């Protein structure tokens, strides 16, 4: 698949290295699940995310 | 931030404030437990800088605060206040003791040079800091934030008689009333990408605040992603 087509369905980053294959990758603190496209936190607090209730309720 | 809103505690975990000759004179962002990103012009030789992470009300004690001392300053090598003080306006700060990450102290995401530039193109960014809440007025006791649309490169270059280098960019409104102001520079300009925020800029300078016709100049972080990733990498 062209890595240019909808980012290759990769949640974050997409590429094409060896046999111009659409590889996905995440950013530090995240690891790629078996869903092979989505990223999952690999640390208690990954970057760029809010983890404090925005509501008291 | 003029024309902004009060942030909820823990809404921008990566945000930090800098204290020296004056309190909250500049902002910053957490790259990781030991590194902060900020503006180069915020670091005037001599002044001892103090960094507080987990900050909300700059006046009270929320118990989420974390103070740290800077044991090193690395301004971008192309930065030269003699020639110009806003060109290559980006610097790194190494903390003495590592910050303890939690819901109030979380780093910002820095993406590839290529994506950083794509996320910037999404049009909207979030800017936050404890700077002036009115052009020439008082500062904010509580962290303020504001969403700013990206401004046309042609428009940007035509708004000032000063040279806008390709290292910087414009954001803000044509109307005015809402802008970043002094005390905010060094702070983050983030873009949210499906619930995950990435640093897309650094609040640098401007001409007055929220004045119609003029915008806020931000450092195009995409041209610096690598330098950051390099000198902040942990060992
Ligand atoms: N956006 C601005 N006008 C601005 C931002 C920072 C600053 N220090 C001065 C002016
Ligand atoms: Ca406080």
Number of strands of chain B: 13
Task: Determine the fraction of residues in helical runs of chain A and give it as a percent range.
Answer: under 10%
Number of strands of chain A: 4
Tell me the strand percentage band of chain A. 15-25%
PDB class: coagulation factor
Keywords: serine proteinase, blood coagulation, coagulation factor
Assembly: dimeric
Entry title: human coagulation factor IXA in complex with P-amino benzamidine
What's the helix and strand layout?
The complex is a heterodimer of chains A (57) and B (235).
Chain A (H helix, E strand, L loop, with lengths): L12 E4 L5 E4 L4 E3 L6 E3 L16
Antiparallel strand pairs in A: 1-2, 3-4
Chain B lengths: L4 E2 L8 E5 L6 E7 L2 E4 L11 E4 L12 E10 L15 E5 L17 H8 L3 E6 L14 E6 L3 H7 L8 E4 L16 E5 L4 E10 L9 E5 L4 H8 L3
Antiparallel strand pairs in B: 1-9, 2-3, 2-5, 3-4, 4-7, 5-6, 6-7, 8-9, 8-11, 10-13, 11-12, 12-13
The site of P-amino benzamidine has 11 residues of chain B, from strand 12.
Protein name (chain B): Coagulation factor IXa heavy chain
Short overview:
The complex is a heterodimer of chains A (57) and B (235). Chain A has 57 residues and is mainly beta.
């Amino acid at each position: 698949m062209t890595c240019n087509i909808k980012n290759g369905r990769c949640e974050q980053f997409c590429k094409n290295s060896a046999d111009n294959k659409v590889v996905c990758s995440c950013t530090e603190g995240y690891r790629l699940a078996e869903n092979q496209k989505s990223c999952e936190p690999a640390v208690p607090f990954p970057c760029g995310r809010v983890s404090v209730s925005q509501t008291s309720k | 931030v003029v024309g902004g809103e009060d942030a909820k505690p823990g809404q921008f975990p990566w945000q930090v404030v800098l204290n020296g000759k004056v309190d909250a004179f500049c902002g910053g962002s957490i790259v990781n437990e030991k590194w902060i990103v900020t503006a180069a012009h915020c670091v005037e030789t001599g002044v001892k800088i103090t960094v507080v992470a987990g900050e909300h009300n700059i006046e009270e004690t929320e118990h989420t605060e974390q103070k740290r001392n800077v044991i090193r300053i690395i301004p971008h090598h192309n930065y030269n206040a003699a020639i110009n003080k806003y060109n290559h306006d980006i610097a790194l700060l190494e903390l003495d003791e590592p910050l303890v990450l939690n819901s109030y102290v979380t780093p910002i995401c820095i993406a590839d040079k290529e994506y950083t530039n794509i996320f910037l193109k999404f049009g909207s960014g979030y800017v936050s800091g404890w700077g002036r809440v009115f052009h020439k007025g008082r500062s904010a006791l509580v962290l303020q934030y504001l969403r700013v649309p990206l401004v046309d490169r042609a428009t940007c270059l035509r708004s000032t008689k000063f040279t806008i280098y390709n290292n910087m960019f414009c954001a803000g409104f044509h109307e005015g009333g809402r802008d970043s102001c002094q005390g905010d520079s060094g702070g983050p300009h983030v873009t949210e990408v499906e619930g995950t925020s990435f640093l897309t800029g650094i609040i640098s300078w401007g001409e007055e605040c929220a004045m119609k016709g003029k915008y806020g100049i931000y450092t195009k972080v995409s041209r610096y992603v690598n330098w950051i990733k390099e000198k902040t990498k942990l060992t």
